[PDB]
Design a protein around this ligand. Structure first.
Ligand SMILES: [Mg+2]
Length: 276
DNA sequence: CGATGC
């Protein structure tokens, strides 16, 4: 049915003003996204940090428009070593992070340009494009190994500094997170193994699902719609894109937004407001 | 993976 993202809440349960705006977007290919004017939307959104997934673009063959982005001048990219036109992520920031790194410290999982880590003064930001299980659960064995390695890597990071994880985690956690839970219970993105992995991640690290924490029973809020059969026009979708937070950041959480109407990809952007 | 039609 209907999802209308509520107005932007820019103050925390404390009462402090939001100071940081992070936007995450699976752009389904940088060049296609830019031609659909995705950068015009980003300029209006004016995030402090922009995280992109499925750039599908080699680090050294980036569109020139990305140079023309004045408030996001510190830009870091990662793409597959072997593959091209496949996966790829980016992290663009108004202020320079203290340190950047790539991957999750495990060679097997670090070959596909999926993870960038950006350390800031008071928190560490990870953006991720999580591996897809495959039409029919083909790579679901690999994906369960990814989940375990990813969880271990993130618990490590969170033990040193408060953690914000964002991006396309490629799972709808609960039935409320997709339109057809029944028909997809053996499809990539909604297998019990993927959902259990996600739940493990929440409590093991631990991390809070920022959107679901603020809006525990808001249904029909999705971040992805298959282009097939114009699913988006019908709001037949999945919530695959998240901001997960360390519990210590929850007093900082102002809002977690789903930018339902922003066009340019088969995912829409999500945006996080933190008071730091 | 939404649509389909045991
Ligand atoms: Mg995709």
């Amino acid at each position: 049915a209907l999802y209308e993202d509520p107005p932007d809440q820019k103050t925390s349960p404390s009462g402090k003003p939001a100071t940081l705006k992070i936007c995450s977007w699976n752009v389904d290919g940088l060049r296609a996204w830019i031609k659909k004017k995705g950068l015009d939307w980003v300029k209006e959104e004016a995030p402090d940090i922009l995280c992109l997934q499925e750039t599908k673009c080699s680090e050294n063959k980036l569109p020139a428009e990305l140079q023309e982005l004045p408030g996001l001048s510190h830009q870091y990219w990662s793409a597959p070593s072997d593959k091209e036109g496949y996966s790829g992520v980016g992290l663009l920031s108004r202020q320079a992070p203290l340190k950047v790194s790539y991957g999750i410290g495990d060679e097997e999982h670090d070959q596909e340009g999926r993870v960038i880590v950006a350390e800031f003064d008071s928190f560490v930001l990870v953006t991720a494009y999580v591996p897809n299980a495959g039409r029919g659960l083909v790579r679901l064995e690999y994906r369960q190994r990814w989940d375990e390695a990813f969880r271990k890597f993130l618990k490590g990071l969170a033990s040193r500094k408060p953690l914000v994880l964002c991006g396309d985690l490629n799972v709808a956690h609960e039935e409320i997170d997709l339109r057809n839970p029944k028909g997809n219970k053996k499809n990539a993105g909604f297998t019990p193994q993927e959902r259990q992995g996600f739940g493990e991640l929440l409590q093991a690290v631990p991390l809070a699902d920022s959107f679901r924490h603020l809006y525990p029973n808001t249904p029909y809020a999705y971040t992805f719609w298959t282009y097939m059969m114009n699913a988006r026009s019908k709001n037949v979708g999945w919530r695959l894109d998240y901001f997960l937070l360390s519990h210590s950041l929850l007093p900082a959480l102002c809002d977690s937004k789903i930018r339902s109407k922003a066009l340019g990809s088969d995912h829409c952007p999500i945006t996080l407001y933190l008071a730091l």
